[PDB]
Amino acid sequence: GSVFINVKCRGSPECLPKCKEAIGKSAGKCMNGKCKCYP
């Protein structure tokens, strides 16, 4: 499962820097309006 973060998004690319800062990897997607990250 992905790591859920409380950061809203309208597409997946914007999540990559948010994920990198939250969990340390530029790996993620926007799902149901919030970023999901993969450590």
Residue with tokens 């990897």: 25
Question: Which domain CATH number covers 32?
Answer: 3.30.30.10
- Please count the structural domains in the chain: 1
Q: Which distant-in-sequence residues (6+ apart) come within 8 Å of 37 by Cβ?
A: 2, 3, 4, 5, 15, 18, 19, 22, 23, 25, 27, 28
Q: Which amino acid is at 13?
A: P
- Contact between 26 and 17 under an 8 Å Cβ cutoff? The reply is yes
Q: Which two tokens stand for residue 8?
A: 């809203």
Range of the domain at 32: 3-37
HEC assignment per residue over the chain:
CCEEEEEECCCCCCHHHHHHHHHCCCCEEEECCEEEECC
Residue with tokens 């999540």: 15
How were these coordinates obtained? X-ray
What phi, psi does 4 have (nearest 5°)?
-80, 135
- To one decimal, the resolution in angstroms is 1.8
Residue with tokens 């914007």: 14
